[PDB]
């Protein structure tokens, strides 16, 4: 199953996926990844268990790598998703797959691959698990063209706070990755335990002061 | 094959005429979602120079048909040194299988003298040549305002060719301007994809024609 | 012998390379191009063993061509030069290998204009200046003693028209034409055919 | 209605011991029309009888050259006729390349019939659907061989294969006794009155059907089509 | 009308009690579904016509071919579409081209048909092979089992038997070309039933002095003028 | 557009083809095309599924003459593509709703006339279409292989050849087969429509006339494929339960069957 | 090192005529100084109508006319009618240049008759280059017989003479005169002359004494 | 050999002698060197004889598959190409081909330089052969875009004629081509000696 | 699939075999009873080591299981040929469970019936995992296959802590083997293997004893 989130800014994209356990003692250490850096300036969430997750995340990577060979620049981010989407078009992999990278051609970007082979270009989607209670919630609120990464870090814990099952949203349970542009460098910096504390804590700030 | 050619109908409208000097060939842009990014949805490919190409049906199915079109048009270019006739990739489209792919194609371009192609890939593989010819959604009733309007005095200048290929689209493309997509040659120089300013123009003066 | 010059400027790359073709004691074309474009703004320029250029320069012209199509965008100058690059490597201990040498010129929209040596063993370096040929010998002293890097387009022609005389004055072969080309943000110039 | 069991691959026995697909290829020689095969001392003779299309069409070829000395005739299916040919004209070619002499026709013959056991016990594949009637002359004088879709091949005095070829084969064994001292006139005359046997009572052999195929000791195999039967077949007798 | 069937059709690679590979019988009696096709041997020349049947006239009708030119002095005329004849038909201009740069001649229209007919070795395709060659005038069908017979006049297609019995009837050995070409329109006309224009029909004549040639527009409506 | 309208009319309508939506038929007729579905004009094929969905349709016991006498009347027509379509469109229109023909005596001696009457024409199509129509309509016996009929078929089994003419061939004298090989090609036609009506039976009067058939082999064409098709057609049948199909034979009629060759082109 | 080639000697002339072609060839077969024998032909019959003569390596000659035996036979089989004398020609131009890099060490002369009626003569390098000539020899002794046949067939360097159609019994009169002339003067050549006279009528083949040194 | 061809107003003009040696015997006096392709190309034949003749006839087979498969006369251009292409296969393993592919195309008159090594350069002028610097001379002196037909064809034949007067692998008799619009035409077989007496006497 | 599920019963008809990810290494106890008294224990082994720091053992199939035994073998020898670094437990299994991942993609075989505990100690660190038929694989802290699994595995959740140390992990896999012994185990007819810092070794059946005899 699984569940992530992918919402592209003006200054950058995340992905916001879920760390759920099914069982009390599945260690974590091995199942607490679920965003999956690909090269220098782009990363991907799945839809699925960590195996094929895997068998997805290094054809990808090498994918990356043989382009980096080739031309000493980083692939293009459409041009990943184009070259898999082609290798899943001449297996017609029951998994989905949402991409945030950074090219230079196109700026921050978010895609999302099916099975069968296509993909789409989006500006906040989501696969997984209520993937249709995500969108149809995020088409709502995703203010298109004029949010900022603050505004997508609420975006994504308002999205998942009603849409995850784990019945209290907290820090352990979502992995947050965030790709920004810092001085030429992109960053994909996964945002760490106390930052997503800091943002559950000030969304429940805005719901309570709402509810009076 | 049949399969492959109730594909073509489900999808979108692609118009194709050949003028003159120009060869023009638009296309039912379509709303595919709200926070679906439509770049990554073109369904009008340029093959080598000189050659475009607008398909109707499976956009996962013609994109390894347009990699393998536009590989082989550097392929010739390469063995025989000049462009690829538009009979030529033509032949070479409607002789790729896969089952067939899914598609049918209508390849606008021009020759290495100068003379405007047009042509029109079937899923059985089955080519042949046209003067104007719509492909798609609705393409019967297309093609049947095109036996009534295609004539020489309605194609004798540029924009009248243009605005030929747009009046075939407003037929079945209700939207009435910003929602087609068009694509224009003029010999030895390249693709000009038109701009949603220069359409809105050109169906401007197709509207002010029809107060008279 | 075959004659290669790129010339860096800021905002510029000019290009020149000798216009003739020879077959052991006698010239059998003298309006002969050694720069194929490969992009709006990216020039090879190839000398080398005779085949191998054309054969080499001209895949490497449709494999950028393919990626422009494919891709609804160039390369870089960066690219190119490191796609052929590893091309050429790649050539380099197999049964095939290509003797060419190798000027990539290109102006980049980020990264401004780029001028790329390569050798036949297809080591890439990135130049200010550079040239091929046994002429090289003899013109890349005149660019090290007059070029400066903020050097303006005109003074450029100016120190290849130096360097062309030099070739004129010096060298032993007969090469009296030489295309010249300014790649810009503007594309591929072609400028008048220095002639003597 | 009775549907079985074992007649779908070559590679199923039947529990009565039995392969059904050879046993339904064996006839689909008599699915062609009748040839006869026939040898004397010196001589051996092939004749067959072949139909067209159509009164424009200009009758399929039976008789095929392998070699200067091996002609064969079919009976089945054509299109592996003809990659027997290919096979067999291949044989002859390579032992004339080799070793300058040509085949013994029993040696092509056993090479024939084991080409034509494999597809009988592998799966995927059908049993050559064609009888070969092969005349050769070699050291051993002349030879007439059958070869049939159950890769089983007959070294015979004469031989009649295709449709309603039973009364052609009584023709020969009855006059089987007279075949080895004829000449070769008498010989081609009795091959056409074992053809002519294999008839309807309103049909005759007329120079468009009959191909007539003969090798011999000093004569190498030459076939005789639509004008050349004439010296052969103006010298019978009306139908009894 | 209804249904007839049994346990030993439709069996792709597998004898019948009759020695009969039924699979292959129904896939070459489904090869009727093409446009009729009149090929007609003569003395001067051979001839052939087939019918074309344009969708639209917005659509070229010298872009579907249906007679194509093997080499200078064979062409050939197919029935079904053109995309399963197109590598048989590529097939036979290889197989003439390397002929003539083996034996530096021209094949024979038999030739032709028979290595067409080892790459037919279904493929679901009937062909007719007319040409000129040292042994005169040829024409040769070609079913798509890969049997090919000469045949001095044969009709392919939808209404094969229908217009081969009026072949049967027309033709003779004295036949001129012409007559011939007035026939084979003749008999076009009668089993399609549609005014003879030329958009609905090609016709090609391959005679002994000229070669290949494929009628023009001006050239067959001269034809059809005394029809 | 009235085409496309009765496209619509046919499944909606409570009572589907009035009697002034039946002269639109034999002009439908001559237009629908013969063998194949593929892509004619979009007013062939238009034509084509409205006459297949129209014949497929139930009709009134007063209606059974008209759509007959429309029939009858485009079956009399100088279109051979028109005399095929009405004869399988009466294919599908008598076994659609077939006993309200059945129930009526004039209506099944007017089909077996207009059968018997195709099966004579001038066009080979519509001949091997009128047997193959006969042979349906005698197989589910709404039409009854009489002893007139056996006469009939038999006594134009045995027409003549024609004496062929060597005239040059004539001056111009030909592109009409013959008079005397459709008479011929007709009777073989009838008995192979009579051989094919019991597909997996043979019944009493199979085994005699089956011999009939076996004396037109070297009956020259059409008549050679016509009794090739048919008894390949036969004996592919035939074989499932041929031991106790073979005891209607006697052993002179089991030795007759072995010895035809019905075989195709692509075999000898 | 193994050396895959030995000059075997040999020398072969046909003459093309206008309804004869004449196809000689001496029969000593030599290695060294040695001669491994002295009746070894160097003409082979393809056809009725076609004689080839091969000289130079003899087990490429060997090997190479057993080729054009077996695709003679393959010919007739695919086509049903023998070759033409140009057919030949151009199939063992294919023959010897598919041995590009390996070569058939063997001079090819091809005389016989074209498709109507009249002499030919082709002449092959051992890589496959051929074209018709009036006359040819090849093989050991060529730079001898060749300048004597471009005087008296080829009426050269010749003023005030009469250019008269060679007839067959003068051309057998100038072959007989040529290989005596070369059993002098070239070693390989002797010890009798093979000469192949292809007609409508036919190939007869006559034998003449040479030197037996 | 020598074997020239240089471009003009009303065509190509290809002239070649006849020559062809084995060291220093002369094997042929007689051999056509310019190679009929097709009724629309000539090639020429230096070096291998045997080359150009095979790789220039898998040419002419390709150039005809090209016009079947497609329904037009294939350009000068890509027969060169085509040549260059199938010859460069080859470079090191010893192919000796040197050749000038002339047609008109619908570009104008065609000229392409195509050797085995894999030169493949278009031009006005060019000359091949061993006697190619003669030919060189002659030509270039006598040279203009703007001949008449007569003195081109007396330019070609006489430079031919003074590369054979050096060269001594250059003999025998010029063999003068011109391509103009619709294919070529054959216009002389002139012997040396002949256009010795015409040139002095 | 269907045969992943059916491959899967295989599984779960296999003996117990329990391992217990300790804070200082990692157990690997299994069930190795003897259907007779006529074969001889000590020849077949069960558990089973991969390197000197990977051990692994199974619930199943047994010759299914020597197939990966081998190939587990195989691929880490090849990753040490090339780095020449022992290969990391997690690595090792991505690789296994590549390989029992293929053989049910492919047509003509069926899948293993049999699901691996691979145990392992690298970089100072324990690592417990389970690779499934699927050619799926989890990181576990405690868990059980083959016969009872499922009491096993509410077992081990209940007596499963994360200061245990090695000794206890070994008392508390004997027990989750011994609530499903079905007769008094013994040295003889239990297995157990561990990893530490000084790598993977299986148990001498004395070393067994004392361990059994603390219960």
Redesign the interface.
Known sequence: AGTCLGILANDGVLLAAERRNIHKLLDEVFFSEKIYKLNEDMACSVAGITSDANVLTNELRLIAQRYLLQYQEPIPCEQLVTALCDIKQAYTFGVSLLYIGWDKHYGFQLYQSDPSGNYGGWKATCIGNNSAAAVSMLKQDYKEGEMTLKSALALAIKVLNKTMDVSKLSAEKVEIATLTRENGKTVIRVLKQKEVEQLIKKHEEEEAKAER | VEYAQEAVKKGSTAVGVRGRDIVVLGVEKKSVAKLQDERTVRKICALDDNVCMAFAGLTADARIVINRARVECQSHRLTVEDPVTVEYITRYIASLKQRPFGISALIVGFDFDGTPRLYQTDPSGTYHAWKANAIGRGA?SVREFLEKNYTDEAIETDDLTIKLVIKALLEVVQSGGKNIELAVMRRDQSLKILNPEEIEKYVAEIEKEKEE | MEYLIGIQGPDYVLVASDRVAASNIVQMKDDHDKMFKMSEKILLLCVGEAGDTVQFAEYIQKNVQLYKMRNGYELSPTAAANFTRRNLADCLRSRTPYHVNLLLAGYDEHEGPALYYMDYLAALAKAPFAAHGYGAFLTLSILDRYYTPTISRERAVELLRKCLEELQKRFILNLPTFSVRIIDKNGIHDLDNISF | ???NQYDNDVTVWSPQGRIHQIEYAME?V????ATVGLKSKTHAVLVAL??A???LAAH?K?ILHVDNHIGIS??????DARLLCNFMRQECLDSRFVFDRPLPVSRLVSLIGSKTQIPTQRYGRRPYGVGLLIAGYDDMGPHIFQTCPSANYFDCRAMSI???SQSARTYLERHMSEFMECNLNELVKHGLRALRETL?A??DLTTKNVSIGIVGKDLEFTIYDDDDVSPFLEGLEERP | ??L?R????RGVNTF???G?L?QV?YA?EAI??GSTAIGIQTSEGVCLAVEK?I?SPLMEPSSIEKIVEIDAHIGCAMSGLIADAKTLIDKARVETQNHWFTYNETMTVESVTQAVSNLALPFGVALLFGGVDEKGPQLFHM?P???F?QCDARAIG??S??A???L???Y?K?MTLKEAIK?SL??LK?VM?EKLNATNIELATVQPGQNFHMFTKEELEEVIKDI | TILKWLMASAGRSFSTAVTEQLQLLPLFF?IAP???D?????LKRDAKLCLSLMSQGLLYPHQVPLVLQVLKQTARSS???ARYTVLTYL?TMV?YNLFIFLNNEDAVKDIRWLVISLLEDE???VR?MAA??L???L??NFLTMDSPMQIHFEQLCKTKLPKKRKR??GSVG?????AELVKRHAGVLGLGACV?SS??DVPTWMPQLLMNLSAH??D???IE?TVKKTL??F???H???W?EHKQQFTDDQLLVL????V?????? | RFSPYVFNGGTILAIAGEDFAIVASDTRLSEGFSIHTRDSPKCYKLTDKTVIGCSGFHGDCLTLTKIIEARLKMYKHSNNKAMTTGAIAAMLSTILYSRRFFPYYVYNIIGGLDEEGKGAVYSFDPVGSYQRDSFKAGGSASAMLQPLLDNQVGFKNMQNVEHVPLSLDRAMRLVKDVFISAAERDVYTGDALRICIVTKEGIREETVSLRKD | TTTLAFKFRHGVIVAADSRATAGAYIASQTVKKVIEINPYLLGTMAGGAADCSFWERLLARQCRIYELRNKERISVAAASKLLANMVYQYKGMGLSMGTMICGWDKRGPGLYYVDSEGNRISGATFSVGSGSVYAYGVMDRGYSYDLEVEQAYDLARRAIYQATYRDAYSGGAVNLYHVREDGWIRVSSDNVADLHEKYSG | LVQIEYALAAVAGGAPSVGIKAANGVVLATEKKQKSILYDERSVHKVEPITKHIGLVYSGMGPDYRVLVHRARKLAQQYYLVYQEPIPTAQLVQRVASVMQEYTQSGGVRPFGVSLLICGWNEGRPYLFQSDPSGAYFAWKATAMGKNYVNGKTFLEKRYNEDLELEDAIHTAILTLKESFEGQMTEDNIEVGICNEAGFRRLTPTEVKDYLAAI
């Open positions: 019967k | 209605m009775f549907r689909a008599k699915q062609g029309s072949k139909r299309q159509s009164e399929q039976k079919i009976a089945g299916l054509t299109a295709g449709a309603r309807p309103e049909q | 009308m209804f007839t049994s346990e030993y059709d019948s009690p009759e009969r039924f019988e070459i009727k579904l049947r969708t079913d089992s890969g049997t017979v939808s209404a038997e229908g081969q019995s009026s049967q009837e027309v003779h004295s026939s003749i008999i009668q039933e | 001559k013969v063998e194949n593929n892509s004619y004009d979009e279109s051979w593509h294919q076994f066009q080979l199509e091997e193959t129509t042979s349906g309509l197989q589910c040059d061939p030909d592109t009409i087969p013959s094919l597909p997996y082999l070297n020259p064409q059409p494929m390949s057609n004996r592919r049948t074989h499932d339960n031991q072995t010895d035809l060759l075989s195709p082109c692509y075999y000898a």
